[PDB]
Amino acid sequence: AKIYTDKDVSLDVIKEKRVAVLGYGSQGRAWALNLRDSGIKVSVGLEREGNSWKQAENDGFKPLRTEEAVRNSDIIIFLLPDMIQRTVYLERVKPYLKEGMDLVFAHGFNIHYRLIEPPSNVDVYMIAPKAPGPIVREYFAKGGGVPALVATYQDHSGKALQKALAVAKAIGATRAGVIETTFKEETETDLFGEQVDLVGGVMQLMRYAFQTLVEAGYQPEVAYFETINEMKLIVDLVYEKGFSGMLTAVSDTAKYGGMTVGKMVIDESVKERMKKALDNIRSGKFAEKWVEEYGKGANTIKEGMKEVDNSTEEKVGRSLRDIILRGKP
Amino acid sequence: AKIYTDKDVSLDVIKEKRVAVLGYGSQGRAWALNLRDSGIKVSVGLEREGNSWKQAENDGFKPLRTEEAVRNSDIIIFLLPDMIQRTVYLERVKPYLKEGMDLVFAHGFNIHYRLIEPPSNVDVYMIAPKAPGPIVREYFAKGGGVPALVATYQDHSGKALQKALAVAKAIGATRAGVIETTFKEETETDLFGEQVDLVGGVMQLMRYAFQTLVEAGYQPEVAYFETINEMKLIVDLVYEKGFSGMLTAVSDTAKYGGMTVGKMVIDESVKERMKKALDNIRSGKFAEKWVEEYGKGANTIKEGMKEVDNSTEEKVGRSLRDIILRGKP
Ligand SMILES: [Mg+2]
Ligand SMILES: [Mg+2]
């Protein structure tokens, strides 16, 4: 697939545009800081004069209520939680849209699932950096940057890909590299990864391994080092060198064990259930169910966070993190 | 558990002893470099004059053939691959052992499974740091250190735990903290983590999720970012702030999906199969099976490595790491 880097993209297409960054969480901050450093006129737009508003004041912005930021801008960037974008949009963005304005997202969920339904006469596009806000910012600030995906949903102007690329350049992404996708692809793949692998899957895998050891009578601190803490070593090596690289770096005892037992533990029925999860994303069932849960108060999340907070593993983990911090220079 | 720090041991217990570090891979290097900085007399002993040998020379060591390092030393540290230790021991160490010498390990495997059966007149102990060699070295050299586990197998002197902690102090581990375990516990828990979690488990988990997306027709590059590359972001968060902190850092959508779908994918039958793997470790079946396999050339590893090296997943990953490399500061 085509990879775009600094050289392939001009800022001219957004240089003269006023950008509203809606939100000043971890992403909103990073983007607002990078855009402003790249010479883009940024207004931060916020629903409340709360902690976010203060943080933005602390960074030399003068924040505005959402609607005032929108009325004074050309390019509107939604860096708000997915579940509250709909309400902010309808009440504080929609009535202010004019021909030729742009709606810009970091995630495809709301557009793809019709929670925000834009008019036909604006451009709609996305830049999805592949790192946390702090890194997005740090790397840009050191003359590098983080890769991202870009997509266009509605290209009314004919320049929507160029504009998406320019935004991505202004936040440092083209220093690393950018690849084009679609709103649908980014949404479905992001939901799938989070559910089966990145958050759901690996958390349950690590937690089961930890529990198995503690239930068999081994020391909890030993069990935590072996099943949770060491995972960084492994995943750092995959990130840096691929699986091949990682496998070369571990013992032959580890390779033999991982190759023979790994597939018995994570067997074909797991893959079959991942297919089912993907089917549930693709049919819309997952998004329907989540929107329904959220509408009832997200009690699943509250109960699960309480269980994690009070678990044995969390207690043990805290203690080993004091030990690691104690020796970190 | 009791955590030991610098206040719990004086280097005096080993300051006057000559140490042979057998091997000069990433661990042998780190330990040799730290010990010498702590003012411990270090000799590097090696079976061949190849790359390890040259690196030791680069670091200012004059390396010796293994048996010459042993004859000239009091404390023999095995920092060699587990499956070669037995033959190095029989051929190059055991003939030269004398009362009061120490046999020191970084992993319990060879002592626990009777592949090395030490004589009755030596101490036998272990120090098992909980980070890669480079870090062992880096933190030490920066005035911190990395935590480790210690264990005693045969305490002929009555001071084996003091000597283990002293070696750990000399490589900086007591700057962070050290926990005592046993050779059995270290062995069984290290085998278990590699097999079901750290290597076997997570690799099968990530590959299967990649494969699911690719099979469904998503762009492989997108699939790789979402199922493999982004793992580092989550695991880093767990490493730094535990599961509660990771979960606070991800979206509510991610939380809900991980808590509901993750548990459907990684169900309690996975745990049950982890328990069977642990039973197979505990009975010695795994170790028998591996020792047998290794003695036949470890053809399982070679074919597994080829299969990984020419996988779609791996081809994709090569490209994307140029991207990231391209933007790091
Ligand atoms: Mg993502
Ligand atoms: Mg280990």
Residue numbers in the entry:
A (entry chain B), B (entry chain A): 2 to 330
What does the paper say about this structure?
The BCAAs are synthesized from pyruvate by a common pathway that involves acetolactate synthase (ALS), ketol-acid reductoisomerase (KARI), and dihydroxy-acid dehydratase (DHAD). As a bifunctional key enzyme, KARI catalyzes an essential two-step reaction for BCAA biosynthesis. Proteins of both classes fold into an N-terminal Rossmann domain and a C-terminal “knot” domain.
